[PDB]
Amino acid sequence: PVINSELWHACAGPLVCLPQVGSLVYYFSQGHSEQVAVSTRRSATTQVPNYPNLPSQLMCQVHNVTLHADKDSDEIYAQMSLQPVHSERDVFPVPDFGMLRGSKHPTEFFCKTLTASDTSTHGGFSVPRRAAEKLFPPLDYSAQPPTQELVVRDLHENTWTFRHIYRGQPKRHLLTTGWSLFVGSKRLRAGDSVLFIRDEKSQLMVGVRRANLPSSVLSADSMHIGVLAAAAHATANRTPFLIFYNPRACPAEFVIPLAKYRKAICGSQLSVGMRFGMMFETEDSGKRRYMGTIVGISDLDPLRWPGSKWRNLQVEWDEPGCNDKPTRVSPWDIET
């Protein structure tokens, strides 16, 4: 049974764009370690060894990309198989990878943070008008309650019926019967998000994000050492290595399409003082451009990773707000 790519993408976030299979990429060991530190709640220790043969940006070809979701937690991540390429001799032509499909977000969707009344025993889930009119089939507004049943599929192949009703003073679109069963069964709370989409097959699907336990196989350090050693050993032998990317836990993508890297680096010219826009995901899974200024250009970590493009742009924001946005970003993160 095959995992729904679009719902996976809706859940992943609007800015998530995965490398295509068969494509060249740059793999940034520092970005990898960052994702591991999040998962490990502890940062990459000072001791992790030197790998002289492992560059800060390792050109690979994508052997495979697969999409995963956990049925109890709703954790999602992609597994990518990357082979480092040192010359054209290391590069499988793209046809050798068979037919590929795009990694696309659904164009019809909505996403909402759950309120307290979305999760209360009575009250139901309130749907915004435009979302109900775009995503649900049209109601018979002459019915004494206008109402219908929606059959919705989740990312784990389970089906759920929700009663969709239009009532109240003022009238509101609500999901009632079956909604509280979903909330109960999945242990959703206020603060979590729920998303509805139509996929390419016009299937009505539903996805979940959860707001805000250590491994007892390997120490945090060994996991951090293993990240580095697997890449260094793959580089030496030109063998495939498998990375995981969790787009809800990962602070920044660390597998960067060559085309994206080139547009940002090779052609461009960046300076301290420069103005720039960076896209951020918004609460309803939209995108919003935030402006700032480059205030420095320098190595994130001059000792371990000299000259690394990873997070080498020190930036300040026009609207810092709660000091939400990162103080360092990478050249491929900005537009101008």
Of the candidate spans 144-152, 159-167, 214-222, 312-320, the one that interacts with its own copies by CB under 8 A turns out to be 214-222
227 binds its own copies (CB under 8 A): yes
Q: How far is the CB of 45 from its own copies (least distance, A)?
A: 10
> Looking at beta carbons only, is 77 or 125 nearer to its own copies?
77
| Residue of the chain from 77, 136, 179, 332 that contacts its own copies (CB under 8 A) | 77
| Residue of the chain from 1, 49, 170, 306 that contacts its own copies (CB under 8 A) | 49
Q: How far is the CB of 230 from its own copies (least distance, A)?
A: 4
Residue 221 interacting partner from Cl ion, its own copies, none (CB closer than 5 to 8 Å by kind): its own copies
41 binds its own copies (CB under 8 A): no
Tell me the backbone φ, ψ of residue 66, rounded to 5 degrees.
-125, 150
> Looking at beta carbons only, is 213 or 322 nearer to its own copies?
213
Residue 151 interacting partner from Cl ion, its own copies, none (CB closer than 5 to 8 Å by kind): none
| Residue of the chain from 16, 228, 256, 329 that contacts its own copies (CB under 8 A) | 228
Q: How far is the CB of 50 from Cl ion (least distance, A)?
A: 5
36 binds its own copies (CB under 8 A): yes
3 binds its own copies (CB under 8 A): no
Query: Encoding tokens for residue 246?
Result: 């969790």
Site string for its own copies, 230-249 (x = CB under 8 A): x--x--xx-x-xxxx-x---
User: What 3 state SS string does 93-136 have?
Assistant: CHHHHCCCCCCCCCCEEEEEECCCCCCCCCCCEEECHHHHHHHC
Contact present, 162 and 182 (Cβ < 8 Å): yes
Site string for Cl ion, 286-305 (x = CB under 5 A): ------------------x-
**Chain contacts with its own copies (rule: CB under 8 A):** 36, 39-40, 47-49, 68, 70, 75, 77, 79, 213, 215-219, 221-223, 225-230, 233, 236-237, 239, 241-244, 246
